[PDB]
Amino acid sequence: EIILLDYWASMYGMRTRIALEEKKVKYEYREEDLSNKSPLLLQMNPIHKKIPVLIHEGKPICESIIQVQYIDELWPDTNPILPSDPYQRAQARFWADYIDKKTYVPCKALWSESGEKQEAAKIEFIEVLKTLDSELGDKYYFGGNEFGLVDIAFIGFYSWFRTYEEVANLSIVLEFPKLMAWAQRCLKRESVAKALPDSDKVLKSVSDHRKIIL
């Protein structure tokens, strides 16, 4: 038995969705209302009270990148996610960590803030895009020739690019064509296609929030 507590537009939740589908395991997806969190969510992640929460045979695993590695280590022979080489594996972990650290606050402020905080966030996220663009280089994936951990770690953000462009006056699509091509590559995988919500859906939800709350 596998349960995933998640939020549809969560790029972190999307990672675990993708990892589960890469392994072709069946699981129960449960949508959480983050303004009205379930007893199960609070019981299973008392420390952070965040989604995604992966519940396997009744036991909780928290933090999306830790969940992906957990899923990979349980089913290593089906669509291996992490490299087998320790050095390459260390590098994949580094770049997933980089994404987590650099996007957590700015990407929240991109859609939830205006004024000075949003401005700061724009600068930081553009810096992330430039850095990831440089790291990707001319490879098909962050993982080189094949879809890997860092691809999983960032692809969910693609579903937000249009939102960031519209609500934060960013230019992403025309400025980072290698990243757009990479995203198009990843989207051909059924795991990714299933996990990522429609970009217009995200945009509509975020603009609604900004109208009503701001």
Ligand X SMILES: N[C@@H](CCC(=O)N[C@@H](CS)C(=O)NCC(=O)O)C(=O)O
Binding interface with ligand X (CB under 6 A): 7, 10, 12, 34, 50-52, 63-65, 100
Q: Is 44 annotated as a binding residue?
A: no
Q: Is 51 annotated as a binding residue?
A: yes
Binding-site member from 10, 67, 103, 159 for its own copies (CB under 8 A):
67
Q: Is 37 annotated as a binding residue?
A: yes
Q: Which residues contact 9 (CB under 8 A, 6 or more apart)?
A: 159, 160, 197, 201, 202, 205
Instruction: Report which DSSP code applies to 198.
Output: P
Query: Edge-to-edge strands of the sheet including 53-56?
Result: 28-31, 2-6, 53-56, 59-62
- Tokens of residue 57, six digits: 């045979």
Q: Examine residue 166 and tell whether it contacts Mg ion (CB under 5 A).
A: no
Question: Of the listed pieces 83-91, 110-118, 163-171, 205-213, which binds its own copies according to CB under 8 A?
Answer: 83-91
SS3 61: strand
Q: Examine residue 200 and tell whether it contacts its own copies (CB under 8 A).
A: no
Give me the residues that bind Mg ion (CB under 5 A), please.
143, 146, 148
* Binding footprint of its own copies on the chain (CB under 8 A): 47, 56, 59, 61-63, 66-67, 69-70, 73-74, 86-87, 89-91, 93-94, 97-98, 131
